[PDB]
Write a protein that binds this ligand. Structure first.
Ligand SMILES: CC(=O)N[C@H]1[C@@H](OP(=O)(O)OP(=O)(O)OC[C@H]2O[C@@H](n3ccc(=O)[nH]c3=O)[C@H](O)[C@@H]2O)O[C@H](CO)[C@H](O)[C@@H]1O
Ligand SMILES: O=c1ccn([C@@H]2O[C@H](COP(=O)(O)OP(=O)(O)O)[C@@H](O)[C@H]2O)c(=O)[nH]1
Lengths: 364, 365
């Protein structure tokens, strides 16, 4: 009856990790024991989950991961399960949840060990002779996987989103908003930008900050940014110092009260360099928080489609971002429309049901 | 605060009160309200975002445990305020009461005992003209009994339509679910399955059903079996089954979640209750096209009459009239096919589903 779930890292504050957790909980609800193999588990263990932290070690993450596989398989050979579900690419998965973009594609934007390892493990899932079922959440990547490996179409299953319910604006949103802004010292005429999620460099924190720096006087004195993620802030503190933004930027470690931030803020800014999907984009949306996002993000189309913010087309130019941010912030009418647009869309679209649909496919 | 407090003595997945509560609560949640629950026990899964508080109060007498419960709850509430308080049992401090029970005071004629005084006192707590509790009704029949005993103001009552879940309706593959089920339990084409569904076997008349299975003509009795489904102890009934010789044709099962399989696999729902506020499973049979044999005391029995989806036995109850009726309904396969068809058609035209949305509408203003 047991399901073995594999991922390299569990922590509470990542997209891959919250997806794994919500799927796993649902399979358990459905009457399954839950085994989990991992290199690290931070935060609570739900009741009934057997969590196996692997004792393997290397000065190279790529080799560490190869050892991890052999370790896992050695345990699984001795203790069989019904099905093996992996959230990272490696051999021996029955199902793969594609929480990462296509590696081989990204590479081309040879001889090195890291390249051959990560490409080797991708092919391990996506090769035509592999029997791994693939759970897709970014539509855009499927054709890239097929271009590079020729994976069969029958093997792919596109899931809708799995935003948790707590992210949806509550009936007392105005009260949550006022309490939050009272707490952080934000007045009616202050503007809060929030940049949410770990991976500050990849999600374009540097771009956000330049764009804050380049706002016209009247908007600049009114604007502050809070970034929320596990990353080392120190590489950005130097940027923040250079640009004179000490008094109007803060960077916080990961935390579980993201919905309060979503309600208290005036804009989600997310000018990612690259992103498989971007759960927070939609989390902003169901909170009624306008989004500024680049078009490379897999979930960007939802912002354009619900008219709940602006999507900045490629190629990225700092100058365009600057302009777009200033214009979204000058336009209080536009912002009100995008909040209401987001909330209404949240009431239509299936943005929630990914875990049940993911459970269906794993279980049959 | 947007929190709604929901109060019920017992949550478990396999009761009418409990399922109505779950569905109202999920609807209110989906409209942006966090859900807190006060209860003496909670069995089964806990939906995402639901704060369940299991009260630590204890007494030898249920009625006194209940009074300690109320005090425990009010203490939590006064320290942690909510938007609105909705109860599924009658007690003080309710903004809203959902009447999953019949009128007690009326049933107490069917003075000094502490049990009586408590339940009467908690019912008056809701229904008195000075209480402000709004009442959500599901059995229309009880509203005048309440006004008779308490003088409750008309405007405080709001009659809701039924709240049958979508999954009880015969689906597209009904015949395949039916055939699969009857294969599993070993039922041939000429076998006839009576089902009796709900915890509370005594009140729901399992003794009467059993007598009636026993009194069938040899030829039918040979072909007929009964499955009862609920949480009760089977022990008292296993003496009756034996004493009537019914060992090899009666099974009693614990609460389960696959009730629709049974409704599709059965040949008759039998439900000769002594009393019953409404009776959800009566409409579940109906929307599965399972014909029903029901006493007229059940508040949903009329739906069986109005839809011609089975027969209703008039009060006063007489065992031998039940016997006659069961025999008649089983003997007549064309009438049973007609009651089935009648059930499915009535389900396609009637408002049997929208209770949770209407209840939420009244709770939220
Ligand atoms: C005796 C009595 O006064 N009962 C009341 C109580 O329902 P009861 O639980 O007494 O009976 P009911 O037939 O109204 O409700 C049973 C419900 O539980 C379900 N079920 C039952 C058995 C099982 O194994 N699995 C399962 O899911 C069944 O399919 C239905 O959805 O509350 C109802 C709704 O609030 C009405 O007020 C009923 O009149
Ligand atoms: O401090 C934090 C940062 C992020 N998150 C959640 O982590 C997920 C991040 O997923 P996303 O797709 O935005 O980014 P990824 O981590 O996959 O790059 C979302 O549910 C965020 O709300 C969180 O709970 N706390």
């Amino acid at each position: 009856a047991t399901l073995a779930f594999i991922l390299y890292k569990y922590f509470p504050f990542g997209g891959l990790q919250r997806d794994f957790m919500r799927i796993a909980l649902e399979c358990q609800r459905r009457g399954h024991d839950i085994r989990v193999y991992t290199l690290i588990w931070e935060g609570d263990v739900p009741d009934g989950f057997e969590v196996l932290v692997a004792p393997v070690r290397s000065i190279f993450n790529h080799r560490r991961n190869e050892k991890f596989t052999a370790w896992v398989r050695a345990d699984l050979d001795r203790r069989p399960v019904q099905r093996v579900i992996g959230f990272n690419k490696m051999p021996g998965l029955d199902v793969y949840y594609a929480a990462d973009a296509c590696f081989e594609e990204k590479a081309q934007t040879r001889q090195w060990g890291r390249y051959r390892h990560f490409a080797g493990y991708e092919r391990a899932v996506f090769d035509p002779a592999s029997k791994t079922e693939i759970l897709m959440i970014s539509e855009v990547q499927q054709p890239l996987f097929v271009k590079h490996y020729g994976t069969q179409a029958e093997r792919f299953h596109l899931l809708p989103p799995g935003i948790s319910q707590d992210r949806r604006a509550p009936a007392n949103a105005a009260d949550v908003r006022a309490e939050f802004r009272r707490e952080f010292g934000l007045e009616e005429d202050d503007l809060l930008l929030v940049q949410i999620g770990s991976g500050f460099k990849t999600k374009g924190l540097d771009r956000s900050l330049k764009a804050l720096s380049a706002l016209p006087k009247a908007l600049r004195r009114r604007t502050r940014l809070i970034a929320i993620g596990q990353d080392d802030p120190k590489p950005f503190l130097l940027q923040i110092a250079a640009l004179g933004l000490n008094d109007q930027v803060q960077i916080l470690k990961g935390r579980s009260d993201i919905p309060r931030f979503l309600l208290g803020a005036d804009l989600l800014i997310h000018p990612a360099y690259n992103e498989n999907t971007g759960t927070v984009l939609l989390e902003a949306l169901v909170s009624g928080l306008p989004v500024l996002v680049t078009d490379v993000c897999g979930y960007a189309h939802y912002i354009a489609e619900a008219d709940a913010g602006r999507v900045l087309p490629s190629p990225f130019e700092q100058d365009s971002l600057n302009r777009l941010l200033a214009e979204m912030l000058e336009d209080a009418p536009a912002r009100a429309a995008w909040s209401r647009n987001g909330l209404a869309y949240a009431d239509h679209a299936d943005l929630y049901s990914m875990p049940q649909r993911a459970a269906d496919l794993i279980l049959g």
